[PDB]
């Protein structure tokens, strides 16, 4: 049972088909139209039906060609409110009816941003964006929001005529509004089972350039050029993922470049990749992003989890399949660079929660709780370590890239949980099932705190980012004059992200030790986002002011959440600047992403 959903569960009905009809009204800041689910029984004299529902309005529920009966529940909070069906005729078990349900959303939809012309980069036209996972689906259309349901579905956008709509979902062409000759309506059809949280819609004065034989590159005109440059390894990194999961079966791999407020780094939505603009560091160095999103083709999108309590299975093989196609472009090193990074991410997730908190496990029961509120990278990086730890108790890469290739052809179209994973993995991994039951399976799955045991990781990379990073720990004052620019000279931006992640795990570092580190290394000049990130993190916490209004503005000009959290949390938590953290807040809440500035609240204490 998914305890996320209101809905009927799927031992009950199945959505199998959405035909999505709807006009998008930026001046009311709505979507209306229709939302038709073909919908299969699963049970004897079936009579009525549930579905999920947050802050929409319902104009009518109509079944072959008559309205019917429908009720809203009180809402449940985050859940929303469910939505009960009586269907006009009692199904039997695998009857299909068509139930067509005529909504608006509200403009406080939490799936959707509206943007005013002065938020874009042009100027001149609104634009409009959808964020559904994990919970969201239902703020947009009615439906079974819980990825144990998979439906295919068809659409039909209005939108004035000089904008474009995209959808997770191959273009399917595109006409004159015939209702308005000032619309143009767009249609997609998305014929792979998806579970709803992977519906996407976006709108907006967007172009698009090729960058490989099935990837468009699309933004606002002003980041065209710069995208396709920044992800010109998409292809390379298709064939290998294609190498590693079997074949691609979405047909287009797209990306979509969104404007500065997108709360995550990508989003996987089929056959169109969401990224952040952070991602534009000038040299492809953040594509490990493209990377992860690629992988969640087959992990997510093709196998998936079948509640939310499972998200690890996602994310977890996903930052596995992500770190073999960078260990595949640039070595072995590289990978185990990356991994043993990801361990230094845990590390920090489990200090900032507490050891015994229960975010910190990798099966969590998100029954009474905010899925928003639980997001975290403990999934990623505590699933990654999982299975780098069982890759290398079961003999190595070679031979667990075997599993994960099985894992997914097994699964294919399905969702699934912890259990059957499991199950699988003893099942192939048969002849080694001795090795299998010495894992220590409760504490890994169901424990919080750091994993039982740490996998082994090659030091190559990392050694000169640590020897670099305990020379300024270690530094007196008389030895600040030993520090120069050469310090830097043979580490790649990977190496200097990684000697400030180890520095800042350390922080605060003396005052006069950062500004040396300033007057050495000119860090403030650095645009790419992470070692920004980490740099201006470092300056907070050593309670440097000058970096006060450099770590406002990188808080409140981008909405990533991996950025904007920890940067609103460092500057509430200085002295000399936390009033101007919550002015801030305060000032930018109206203009935020609704999921960003509802946590951003809740991590200042400002309701
Ligand atoms: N610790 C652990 N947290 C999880 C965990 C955390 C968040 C979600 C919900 C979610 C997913 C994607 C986007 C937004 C919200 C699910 C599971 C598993 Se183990
Ligand atoms: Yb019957
Ligand atoms: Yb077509
Ligand atoms: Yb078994
Ligand atoms: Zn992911």
Not at 306 to 315: G, V
Request: aromatic content about 10%.
């Amino acid at each position: 049972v998914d305890t996320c959903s209101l809905a009927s569960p799927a031992s009950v009905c199945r959505t199998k088909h959405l035909h999505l009809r709807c006009s998008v009204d930026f001046t009311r800041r709505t979507l209306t139209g229709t939302a038709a689910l073909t919908v299969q029984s699963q049970e004897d004299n079936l009579r009525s039906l549930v579905l999920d529902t947050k802050d929409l309005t319902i104009e009518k529920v109509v079944i072959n060609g008559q309205e019917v009966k429908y009720a809203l529940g009180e809402r449940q909070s985050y859940k929303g409110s469910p939505m009960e069906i009586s269907l006009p005729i009692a199904l039997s078990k695998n009857q299909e009816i068509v139930i067509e349900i005529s909504f608006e959303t509200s403009p406080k939809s939490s799936a959707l941003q509206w943007l005013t012309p002065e938020q874009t980069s042009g100027k001149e036209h609104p634009y409009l964006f959808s964020q559904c996972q994990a919970i969201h689906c239902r703020a947009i259309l009615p439906c079974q929001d819980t990825p144990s349901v998979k439906l295919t579905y068809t659409a039909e956008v209005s939108v004035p005529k000089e904008l474009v709509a995209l959808m997770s979902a191959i273009r399917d062409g595109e006409t004159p509004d015939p209702e308005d000759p000032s619309r143009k309506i767009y249609k997609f059809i998305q014929k792979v089972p998806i579970p709803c949280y992977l519906i996407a819609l976006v709108v907006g004065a967007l172009e698009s350039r090729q960058i490989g034989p099935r990837t468009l590159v699309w933004s606002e005109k002003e980041q065209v050029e710069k995208s396709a440059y920044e992800f010109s390894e998409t292809e390379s990194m298709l064939k290998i993922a294609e190498d590693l999961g079997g074949p691609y079966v979405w047909g287009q791999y797209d990306l979509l470049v969104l404007p500065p407020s997108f709360p995550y780094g990508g989003m996987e939505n089929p056959c169109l990749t969401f990224v952040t603009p952070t991602l534009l560091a000038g040299d492809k160095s953040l594509s490990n992003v493209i990377a992860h999103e690629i992988s969640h083709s087959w992990t997510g999108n093709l196998v998936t989890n079948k509640t939310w309590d499972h998200f690890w299975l996602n994310e977890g093989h996903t930052v596995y399949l992500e770190r073999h196609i960078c260990g595949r472009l640039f070595g072995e090193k590289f990978r185990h660079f990356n991994a043993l990074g990801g361990w230094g991410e845990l590390q920090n997730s489990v200090k900032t929660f507490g050891e015994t908190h229960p975010f910190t496990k990798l099966v969590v029961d998100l029954t009474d709780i905010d899925p928003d509120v639980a997001y975290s990278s403990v999934p990623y990086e505590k699933g990654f370590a999982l299975l780098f730890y069982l890759e290398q108790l079961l003999g190595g890469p070679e031979i667990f890239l075997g599993f994960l290739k099985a894992y997914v052809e097994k699964f294919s179209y399905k969702s699934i949980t912890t259990d059957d994973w499991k199950d699988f993995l003893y099942s192939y991994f048969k002849d080694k099932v001795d090795v299998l039951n010495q894992v220590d399976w409760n504490a890994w799955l169901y424990s919080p705190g750091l994993p039982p045991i740490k996998p082994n990781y090659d030091m190559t990379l990392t050694n000169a980012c640590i020897a670099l990073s305990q020379r300024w720990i270690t530094a007196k004052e008389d030895d600040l004059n030993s520090f120069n620019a050469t310090d830097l000279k043979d580490l790649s931006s990977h190496q200097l992200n990684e000697f400030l992640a180890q520095t800042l795990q350390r922080a605060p570092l003396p005052l006069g030790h950062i500004k040396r580190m300033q007057e050495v290394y000119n860090f403030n000049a650095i645009n790419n986002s992470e070692i920004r990130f980490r740099w201006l993190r470092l300056c907070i916490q050593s309670k440097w002011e000058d970096a006060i209004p450099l770590a406002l503005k990188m808080a409140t000009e981008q909405g990533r959440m991996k950025f904007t959290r920890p940067l609103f949390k460092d500057l509430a938590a200085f002295d000399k600047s936390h009033d101007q953290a919550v002015r801030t807040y305060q000032e930018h809440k109206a203009s935020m992403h609704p999921v960003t500035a509802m946590l951003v609240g809740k991590d200042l204490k400002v309701d």
